């Protein structure tokens, strides 16, 4: 679980 990957996947269903 990369953090960017989650920051990106956050803001990725935004």
Same mark, same amino acid.
């Not at 679980?1 to 935004?14: Q, S, T, Y």
């Given at each position: =679980?990369?953090? !960017?990957? =989650?920051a +990106?996947? +956050? !803001? !990725? @269903? @935004?």
């Amino acid at each position: =679980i990369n953090w !960017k990957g =989650i920051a +990106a996947m +956050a !803001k !990725k @269903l @935004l």
